[PDB]
Amino acid sequence: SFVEMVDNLRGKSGQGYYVEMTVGSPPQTLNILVDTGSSNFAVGAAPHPFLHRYYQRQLSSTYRDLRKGVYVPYTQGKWEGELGTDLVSIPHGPNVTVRANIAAITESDKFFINGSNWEGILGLAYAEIARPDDSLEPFFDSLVKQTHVPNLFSLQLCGAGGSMIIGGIDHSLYTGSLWYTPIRREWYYEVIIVRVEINGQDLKMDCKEYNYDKSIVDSGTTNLRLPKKVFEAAVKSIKAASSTEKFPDGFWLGEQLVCWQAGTTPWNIFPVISLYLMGEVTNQSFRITILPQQYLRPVEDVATSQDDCYKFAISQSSTGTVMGAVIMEGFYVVFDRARKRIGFAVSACHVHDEFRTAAVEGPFVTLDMEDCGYN
Numbered sequence: 001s002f003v004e005m006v007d008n009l010r011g012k013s014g015q016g017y018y019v020e021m022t023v024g025s026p027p028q029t030l031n032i033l034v035d036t037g038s039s040n041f042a043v044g045a046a047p048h049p050f051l052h053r054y055y056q057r058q059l060s061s062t063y064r065d066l067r068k069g070v071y072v073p074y075t076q077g078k079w080e081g082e083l084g085t086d087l088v089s090i091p092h093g094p095n096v097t098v099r100a101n102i103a104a105i106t107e108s109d110k111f112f113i114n115g116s117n118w119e120g121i122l123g124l125a126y127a128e129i130a131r132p133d134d135s136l137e138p139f140f141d142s143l144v145k146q147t148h149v150p151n152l153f154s155l156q157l158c159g160a161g162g163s164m165i166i167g168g169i170d171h172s173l174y175t176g177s178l179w180y181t182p183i184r185r186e187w188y189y190e191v192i193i194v195r196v197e198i199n200g201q202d203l204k205m206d207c208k209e210y211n212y213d214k215s216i217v218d219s220g221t222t223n224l225r226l227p228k229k230v231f232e233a234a235v236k237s238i239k240a241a242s243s244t245e246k247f248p249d250g251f252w253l254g255e256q257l258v259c260w261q262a263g264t265t266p267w268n269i270f271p272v273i274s275l276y277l278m279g280e281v282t283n284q285s286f287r288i289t290i291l292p293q294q295y296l297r298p299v300e301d302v303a304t305s306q307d308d309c310y311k312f313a314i315s316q317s318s319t320g321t322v323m324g325a326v327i328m329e330g331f332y333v334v335f336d337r338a339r340k341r342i343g344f345a346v347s348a349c350h351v352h353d354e355f356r357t358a359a360v361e362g363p364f365v366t367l368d369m370e371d372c373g374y375n
């Protein structure tokens with residue numbers, strides 16, 4: 001019955017992907033950012049310059065106040081608000097209604113984005129990272145407890161809408177085989193990267209560096225985020241591979257945008273990135289290959305030019321690796337919570353290079369994969 005959930009997501013990589021939800025009685029429609037990097041369900045509940053609508057607890061006969069405050073900080077942005085519960089549904093999702101925890105956002109900083117078209121956030125990760133603590137049951141945990149929806153969902157993010165298949169896997173959204181990596185620990189969607197190659201060359205780092213201090217899969221982060229040491233090695237390699245042309249050093253900080261005459265972007269000088277993930281059997285891994293069309297995010301020209309302009313969508317991190325939306329675009333990603341694993345497959349909405357293709361390939365042999373987890 002998944003065809004009704006195909007294309008139930010709108011939005012871009014740099015704006016976030018959102019799903020339509022309704023809260024309260026009578027139902028109040030709101031667009032909600034889908035975020036696998038957090039675990040709080042929160043909605044704007046007070047006027048804001050960037051909100052065209054928000055949650056009005058007073059108009060809902062089913063609202064219940066929890067009389068407890070909440071604060072949530074992200075890598076960027078933060079909000080605080082009031083906890084409560086209400087009835088929630090997903091119009092283009094499963095045919096159910098659940099009583100879910102809702103954080104009514106009363107104050108925020110650098111959270112809402114002007115003209116993003118979404119008014120809240122749906123944290124899909126586990127209770128361990130929920131605020132104020134792990135006793136606030138996350139939305140997906142509530143959905144699984146109160147209905148018959150199986151304990152998994154999948155995301156097909158398509159770059160320059162998408163699909164969130166709640167409760168299953170839709171085989172028409174991907175080609176080839178699904179490759180699975182264990183969820184190391186149920187807090188973030190944490191995985192273990194066992195090897196990195198750029199244009200087929202091993203970065204030759206201690207694999208602990210790749211997961212320092214963690215590696216997570218996060219639909220709510222735009223960029224691929226890398227730890228300092230890995231980021232510097234990656235940038236050095238990508239620079240050398242594209243030294244044919246000259247770029248401002250602010251481009252490599254994701255600040256300044258580079259432009260090229262319409263239809264002349266020199267894709268071939270930018271390398272592919274292969275991330276190897278721990279597999280399901282002993283000494284086995286598999287790889288996902290990232291094209292430059294993924295980490296060069298297209299942006300609007302700052303002028304009146306008909307040129308193709310891009311921002312560098314790989315940035316430095318101090319909180320571990322983040323496989324953000326630009327990596328997830330072009331793959332079908334299965335968050336198989338029931339079997340504690342995350343699956344990857346080439347998405348049916350993949351970007352077309354001319355000689356190269358994004359891929360998910362295996363099996364590969366990798367010794368001592370366990371040593372790659374940071375402790």
Ligand SMILES: CCCCNC(=O)[C@H](C)C[C@H](O)[C@@H]1CSC/C=C/CS[C@H]2CCCN[C@H]2C(=O)N[C@@H](C)C(=O)N1
Pocket residue numbers: 013014015016035036037038039072073074075076077110111112113129130131218219220221222223322
């Ligand atoms: C309570 C602990 C859980 C906290 N989890 C995290 O902080 C995650 C690592 C990151 C989150 O997935 C977090 C959720 S989105 C919050 C709004 C940001 C404004 S910008 C945001 C939305 C528009 C497109 N860019 C996005 C982005 O790129 N966000 C990164 C910057 C980020 O921060 N994402």
